[PDB]
Amino acid sequence: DLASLAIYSFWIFLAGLIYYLQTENMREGYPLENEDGTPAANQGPFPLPKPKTFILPHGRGTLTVPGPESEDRPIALARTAVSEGFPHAPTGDPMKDGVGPASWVARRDLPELDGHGHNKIKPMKAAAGFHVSAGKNPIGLPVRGCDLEIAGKVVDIWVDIPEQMARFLEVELKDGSTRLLPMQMVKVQSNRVHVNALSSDLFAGIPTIKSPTEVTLLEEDKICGYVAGGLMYAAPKRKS
Template identity: 35%
Template sequence: MDDVKIVGTLDVTQLVFYAFVLFFIALVFYLRREDRREGYPTEAEDTGMPDTMGGPLSRAAPKTFDLPHGQGTVSPDGERRERVDLPAKRAFGSNGAPYVPTGDPFADGLGPAAWAERMHTPDLTASGKPRIVPLSSTDHVSVSPRDPNPVGMPVIGADGETAGMVTEAWVDMSEHHIRYLEIGDAETPGSASPKPVVVETQTVAAVDPATETAVVVETESVRTPASGGPGTGALLVPMAMAKIRKRKGVIVVDALRADQFAGAPRPATPGQITLNEEERIVAYFGGGYLYADPQRQEPII
């Protein structure tokens, strides 16, 4: 017996097949749009111009995130995109060549000193309270008697000089461990007065990719903590980059020289630190492992 025809030679089997094909095509377009919400359209490395190939069917609407504790919503926008006008030169004329700083890499945020533009609000606990707070502001978190208390210990830089005295510890209220050490002057513990930081003259050799000629740049600058970060409050050192020498009673931070500590970014609000300020502080100290001393940029062998 012949199959039941709906219209002409169109039967149920053909109708199901056509519906499946249309569904599959729509599914492919949907998946391709969804997997391009973040990171697309791709951009040229040197100019930052977007790649518009693919048309509107390959790009989805911007993703919107609902923030907890009534903080509203956030969506990726142009203000938080990576910069392309960097004060740096390519080490040699080739795509993928490393960039050599031509200015102050700490302030410019290059290489290991780079940071991401995170939100200018504090990180919060599950209950909606600031997550990173000074130890003295809480009464149910304390340093274990079995561990050395860093408060009162001097902080030694990579050059063996004293950068200051620990005056406070900032703790993580969600994980209950020290995240930052607040330091002041060695002469006047507790004070966090900004000091100018002298950056010695450095000669940097690079190759201009446009002319393929060598470029020699000499830089010399004097800056203060205000120019190195978003605020001029407490001087905070990431605990992850500090080594407590219990027997000697000192804390060693070999990321920076002692005179470079004062140039670190500082929180703008007393007793509070935002996600963006955390990013800037960690980037500053992380960049010191390469830029604190010109010798650190040289080959090991």
């Protein structure tokens, strides 16, 4: 009858849909590799999809996925076992080297632009008309690390102009230079900003940005990866 026909029709449609969906989610990170980087023999049941091409705004070219994958940076790790499946030990400083939870991806050394072609993120001192409108203004507060020591003070907020939100604190260190701190990794309090991820001695190691009025997508990743990695790698200096 007509209802059994409808419910068989649907299950076949759903099989096709799941297939389409699984292959759409294969457009990054494939083909699979062995831990030495050569292509794995077994790539799974579904094949790769035909490539698609994104036209990027503002004259920044195209992207085609799937397409040639390369880390485009050195990975300072070594095998800890003789068979597949075990962890890879850092061979140096995992925070200096950008591995594990401190990892960064080699994105474009360009800033993200808004719908008009201007830099998305600007320090507030250069964003006309932008001010703190609610909450505690962190500018001027000292910054405390997880070792309960003071590493610097907030000298600006870097803001998302089109989305009107704070994205980075700009911290001045005891030697006069500044670093960016992700907003999502600080705790603003009445009389201080507290940073759980980093101990005070690790602030100088935060990657620095090359022009002082803009931050590129690559530097954003290095900064954020570094700060997040301190949760694992700076635990020998965390207190309650």
